[PDB]
Design a protein around this ligand. Structure first.
Ligand code: DHE
Ligand code: HEC
Length: 465
């Protein structure tokens, strides 16, 4: 009965077959982060300050539950998104060929910040020296993952949960092109020569290769092991020194490398893995791959050339290895990583792959960042009842040195530095949130920009260097 209800009240914005429109996509995969009870409240009483109105006046309890069950029930057949669908979605409001190649502003283009405002779905381009905005524009719904840049830092590529890819030109402050690569998307990667964008999708289970200059479609690459078993893509990353993309697969015992030195990467090199990999991190020299297993079997280290498993790292809880950092301690490489289920910062010695120590915190965090100029590692306890402070771990002592509390009570997380590391920018993820600027040397606040749930911020210089 929910189908008819959806057609009369919802399809006006959430689109036919729930694929999206004025409002977001409402497939089961789309709502994986939304509990049905929460989806039920949003339907009855709407979202404040959004175009989603409450329907409690037109629907009763039975109809309410019917819609909820309908949204979370799998369709009789899996929805498609073909090459034809992708090409038809392409738009090009400002092709590069028609735009000059000089910045239209004073700000240092290498110190600009891309700031995601996920509360009202906007993006701010921020002068990294004055800490003031030079542009702001609405974005696609639910941006996730770090926006990727071109090698020269001029272009930036956004990926939305619902599969929309946006190409923005920082020099002219204009949207260049957009295309829908899939229905449920993880992340995208840009090749180190600037030619290619590779989109890793959950739904469909495929990779989508786009031309990096206009987001046009090059080829759709189904994700399936050598036996033909279909799989979702966990994540895609670029290995510059290897001039290749590296793809983690969610559901098959396979790992892919797609080289692009000799042209469009459409043929994968398949490496067998003993256990599934959800996310991974590259060693500073891209020789080794640190992978986190879905099962609590600890971490896994793999040599990329051969594909051999060289070490197994026991890890407390479930480490978010994909966002870890490295640095030199006693002239030796060390690796730190936050955690999703336990309040700990796991630190690993790269030399013998031996875990050094486990730093205790007030709860599991989501992010970790540093800089060659900062003597600390900056992490958080994003996922805990205590979550309003940003922890600064001294690199040499491996102990929580200082703590920053931008807005007591509200959730704080994610750090990004200016290109010279002189300042650090922190986010307060709240409806009454803010982007807060701190002197990374004196650790004193300098400026505060109110924003509606600002998420990540990304410095051009640091990301392309
Ligand atoms: C694989 C991956 C990346 C690296 C992508 C890249 O940049 O190439 C990433 C990055 C990110 C980055 C990029 C930061 C960076 O510094 O690069 C941010 C801000 C972020 C905010 C969130 N992440 Fe993320 N995130 C996951 C996966 C990932 N997140 C999950 O699996 C998880 C736990 C659940 C999910 O449904 O995806 C998840 C939940 C969250 C959130 O709910 C956050 C807090 C808010 C949101 O928008 O959903 N993730
Ligand atoms: C256009 C005005 C809409 C109609 C008609 C319906 N919905 Fe909606 N919905 C719309 C928007 C723009 C948004 C996004 C709000 C925001 O966060 O900015 C939503 C949101 C939802 C959600 C939450 C999705 C999520 O958080 O992941 C749900 C579950 C939802 N809408 C369901 C829903 C149903 C069942 C509708 C018919 C009764 C319906 N919506 C109508 C826009 C519009």
């Amino acid at each position: 009965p929910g189908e008819a209800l959806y057609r009369q009240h919802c399809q006006a914005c959430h689109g036919a077959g729930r694929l999206g429109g004025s409002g977001p996509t409402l497939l089961p995969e789309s709502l994986s982060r939304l509990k049905p009870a929460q989806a039920r409240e949003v339907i009855l009483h709407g979202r404040p300050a959004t175009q989603m109105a409450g329907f409690a006046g037109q629907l009763d309890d039975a109809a309410a539950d019917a819609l909820v069950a309908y949204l979370y029930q799998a369709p009789p057949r899996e929805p498609q998104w073909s090459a034809e669908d992708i090409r038809a979605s392409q738009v090009q409001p400002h092709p590069l060929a028609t735009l000059p190649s000089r910045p239209r502003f004073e700000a240092d283009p290498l110190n600009l910040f891309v700031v995601v405002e996920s509360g009202d779905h906007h993006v701010t381009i921020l002068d990294g020296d004055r800490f003031e905005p030079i542009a702001r524009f609405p974005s696609r719904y639910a941006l996730h993952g770090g926006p990727k840049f071109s090698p020269d830092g001029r272009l930036v590529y956004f990926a939305s949960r619902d599969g929309w890819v946006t190409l923005y030109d920082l020099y002219n402050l204009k949207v260049v092109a957009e295309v829908r690569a899939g229905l449920n998307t993880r992340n995208l990667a840009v090749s180190d020569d600037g030619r290619w964008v590779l989109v890793g999708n959950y739904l469909p289970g495929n990779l989508v290769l786009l031309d990096a200059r206009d987001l046009s479609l090059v080829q759709v690459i189904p994700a399936a092991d050598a036996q033909g078993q279909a799989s979702r893509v966990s994540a895609v990353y670029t290995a510059p020194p290897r001039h290749s993309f590296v793809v983690a697969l969610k559901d098959v015992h396979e790992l892919w490398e797609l080289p692009y030195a000799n042209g469009k990467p459409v043929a994968p090199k398949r490496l067998a893995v003993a256990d599934y990999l959800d996310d991974f991190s590259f060693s500073p020299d891209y020789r080794y791959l640190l992978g986190s297993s879905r099962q609590a079997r600890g971490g896994e280290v793999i040599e990329l050339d051969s594909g051999a498993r060289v070490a197994s790292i026991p890890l407390s809880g479930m480490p978010h290895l994909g966002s870890g950092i490295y640095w030199k301690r006693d002239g030796r490489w060390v690796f730190a990583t936050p955690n999703i289920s336990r309040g700990v910062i796991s630190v690993i010695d790269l030399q013998n792959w031996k875990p050094l120590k486990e730093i205790v915190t007030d709860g599991p965090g989501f992010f970790m960042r540093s800089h060659a100029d900062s003597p600390y590692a900056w992490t958080d306890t994003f996922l805990g009842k205590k979550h309003d402070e940003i922890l600064l771990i001294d690199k040499q002592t491996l102990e929580i040195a200082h703590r920053l509390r931008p807005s007591p009570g509200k959730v704080a997380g994610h750090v990004e530095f200016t290109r010279d590391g002189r300042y650090a920018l922190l986010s307060v993820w709240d409806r009454d949130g803010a982007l807060v600027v701190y002197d990374a040397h004196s650790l004193e606040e300098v400026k505060r920009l109110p924003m509606n749930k600002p998420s990540g911020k990304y410095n051009v210089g640091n990301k392309i260097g």
